[PDB]
Amino acid sequence: VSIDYRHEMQDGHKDRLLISHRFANGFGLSSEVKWAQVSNGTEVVASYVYKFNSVFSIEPGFSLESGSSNNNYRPYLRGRANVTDDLSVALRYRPYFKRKGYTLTGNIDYTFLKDYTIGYELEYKKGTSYDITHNVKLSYKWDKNWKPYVEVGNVSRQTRYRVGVQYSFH
Numbered sequence: 001v002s003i004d005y006r007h008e009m010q011d012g013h014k015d016r017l018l019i020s021h022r023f024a025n026g027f028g029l030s031s032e033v034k035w036a037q038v039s040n041g042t043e044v045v046a047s048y049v050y051k052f053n054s055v056f057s058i059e060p061g062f063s064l065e066s067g068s069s070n071n072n073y074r075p076y077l078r079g080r081a082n083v084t085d086d087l088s089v090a091l092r093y094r095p096y097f098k099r100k101g102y103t104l105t106g107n108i109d110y111t112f113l114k115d116y117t118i119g120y121e122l123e124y125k126k127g128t129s130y131d132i133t134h135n136v137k138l139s140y141k142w143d144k145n146w147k148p149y150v151e152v153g154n155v156s157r158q159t160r161y162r163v164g165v166q167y168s169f170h
């Protein structure tokens with residue numbers, strides 16, 4: 001189980017608290033509460049990660065969000081390839097049916113010096129009623145329980161900044 005708090009600003013603000021767990025069988029569940037300045041929301045996600053082998057995995061997922069402004073059903077399929085022990089790549093297709101469109105999100109993540117991770121995320125969003133996002137995240141496993149992190153992204157025009165920390169139970 002982990003609990004992840006994150007603050008976001010551009011150049012109002014957004015905050016979130018995301019609690020999640022992935023079981024050794026592959027089943028995962030998360031619940032997130034979000035507030036922004038006012039709006040609020042909650043999201044729940046259930047998924048299975050199915051590992052074909054040490055390199056390739058596929059993760060179908062189900063999510064519903066309920067809010068002031070965002071209210072969507074967003075199922076998804078995420079494929080992952082471990083290129084090396086330190087380097088992974090993923091691609092996620094996530095349509096949204098909200099009150100429709102889809103996002104396509106690619107991720108490249110590289111772990112170095114045991115405790116650091118640098119991640120690049122490219123996200124393409126297209127409505128049916130496009131935007132491209134570039135994001136860089138840097139995380140540091142400070143100890144067995146705490147993983148602070150920062151993200152800087154460009155949303156296309158403007159910059160989106162996040163700071164957060166993930167606490168893991170042991």
Ligand SMILES: CCCCCCCCOCCOCCOCCOCCO
Pocket residue numbers: 003004005017165166167
């Ligand atoms: C939701 C904020 C980000 C996740 C941190 C909450 C984890 C709760 O377990 C904390 C146990 O270790 C902390 C011991 O120090 C107590 C500090 O109390 C603040 C907890 O909210």
Ligand SMILES: CCCCCCCCOCCOCCOCCOCCO
Pocket residue numbers: 042043044045046062064065066
């Ligand atoms: C395995 C299928 C999907 C798992 C969903 C689990 C969540 C079920 O909880 C429903 C109970 O509602 C609690 C309070 O409702 C607040 C609104 O919920 C936010 C998103 O629906």
Ligand SMILES: CCCCCCCCOCCOCCOCCOCCO
Pocket residue numbers: 046047048060061062075076077093094095
């Ligand atoms: C992006 C569309 C293709 C991805 C598969 C659809 C996922 C939504 O499935 C709906 C069923 O919801 C229940 C699933 O909850 C258990 C976790 O397993 C994920 C399978 O959906």
Ligand SMILES: CCCCCCCCOCCOCCOCCOCCO
Pocket residue numbers: 077078079080091092093104124
């Ligand atoms: C790893 C398996 C799961 C990954 C998703 C499976 C299928 C994804 O289809 C993508 C749908 O978009 C079609 C065109 O792709 C456009 C790529 O981005 C450039 C924008 O034109």
Ligand SMILES: CCCCCCCCOCCOCCOCCOCCO
Pocket residue numbers: 108109110118119120134135136154157158
């Ligand atoms: C081992 C690979 C993983 C590390 C990759 C991290 C660095 C990747 O940086 C690419 C991010 O590109 C950001 C582009 O910024 C958008 C510029 O938009 C114009 C300014 O408004």
Ligand SMILES: CCCCCCCC
Pocket residue numbers: 001019020021029030031044
């Ligand atoms: C099992 C720990 C995550 C909690 C998710 C709650 C879903 C309603």
Ligand SMILES: CCCCCCCC
Pocket residue numbers: 027029
């Ligand atoms: C993995 C079984 C379901 C866990 C749900 C925890 C309470 C909402």
Ligand SMILES: CCCCCCCC
Pocket residue numbers: 152
């Ligand atoms: C301490 C040097 C500044 C690092 C800048 C990083 C900007 C993304």
